[PDB]
Write a protein that binds this ligand. Structure first.
Ligand SMILES: CC(=O)NC(C)(C)Cc1c([C@@H](C2=C(O)[C@](C)(c3ccc(C)cc3)C2=O)c2ccccc2)[nH]c2cc(C)ccc12
Ligand SMILES: [Zn+2]
Length: 219
């Protein structure tokens, strides 16, 4: 998160920190959010050989009783995900066991112009490491023409988030996190520019409600 503030500890108890293993490199990182006691929503490009989910965190460098470190049994990447266009950048993670409900850990249930909020542990600048603490920022929903320069952007599948006149933005490390508009989840962080100039591209959740319901009902 660029240009944001430190979240109040444990104020977003659905938030998930993902550590992802690839075969021929060190760990990489993404965000996500708990939608059922044994399911986490995130981005398809965050898939790997194996993934560990940490719930209940604020400062990710200091172990505490609120932490739940949970095993992933299976990854459900969207079957139409395209690595060229980045269309359909969405994935469900099934947890080996159901999470415990505490003050610090719980689910987020399901229900241009206005303001929304996004949170994550990602980089705080182009040449700056990821944040030790959970950060968040308020951003403007933009009309789709603001994202024309992303040649594979589509208004039906995606949202355009962040006023180009400000520095505030999601960035690398924040992919898979939720965008909340008046307390309701409307988007998932996907991608943007290498130089971090806003706006960025988010997945539009409403389009995928049939697919999400299908996975949850059969697993
Ligand atoms: C290739 C490339 O450099 N793409 C651009 C867009 C320039 C940079 C970019 C990415 C990028 C990316 C990673 O690296 C990382 C950390 C990751 C994590 C875990 C895994 C397993 C694989 C990768 C991740 O996310 C990415 C995005 C999409 C696809 C692939 C990689 N995400 C953004 C989010 C915003 C807000 C802004 C810009 C970007
Ligand atoms: Zn704590």
């Amino acid at each position: 998160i660029i240009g944001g503030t430190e979240s109040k500890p444990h104020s977003r108890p659905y938030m998930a920190y993902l550590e992802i293993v690839t075969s021929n490199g060190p760990s990489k990182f993404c965000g996500g959010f708990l939608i059922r006691r044994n399911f986490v929503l995130t981005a398809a490009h965050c898939a790997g050989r194996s993934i560990t989910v940490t719930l209940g965190a604020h400062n990710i460098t200091e172990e505490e009783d609120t932490w739940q470190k949970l095993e992933v049994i299976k990854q459900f990447r969207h079957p139409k995900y395209n690595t060229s266009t980045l269309h359909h950048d969405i994935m469900l993670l099934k947890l080996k066991e159901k999470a415990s409900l505490t003050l610090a850990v719980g689910t987020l249930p399901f229900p241009p112009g206005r303001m929304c909020r996004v949170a994550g542990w990602g980089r705080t600048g182009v040449l700056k490491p990821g944040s030790d603490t959970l950060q968040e920022v308020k951003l403007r929903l933009m009309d789709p023409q603001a994202c024309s320069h992303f040649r594979d952007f589509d208004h039906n599948l995606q949202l355009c988030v962040g006023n180009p006149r400000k520095t505030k933005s999601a960035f690398k490390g924040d992919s898979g996190g939720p965008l909340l508009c008046a307390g309701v989840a409307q988007g998932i962080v996907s991608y943007g520019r290498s130089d971090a100039k806003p706006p960025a591209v988010f997945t539009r959740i409403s389009h995928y409600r049939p697919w999400i319901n299908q996975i949850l009902q059969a697993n």
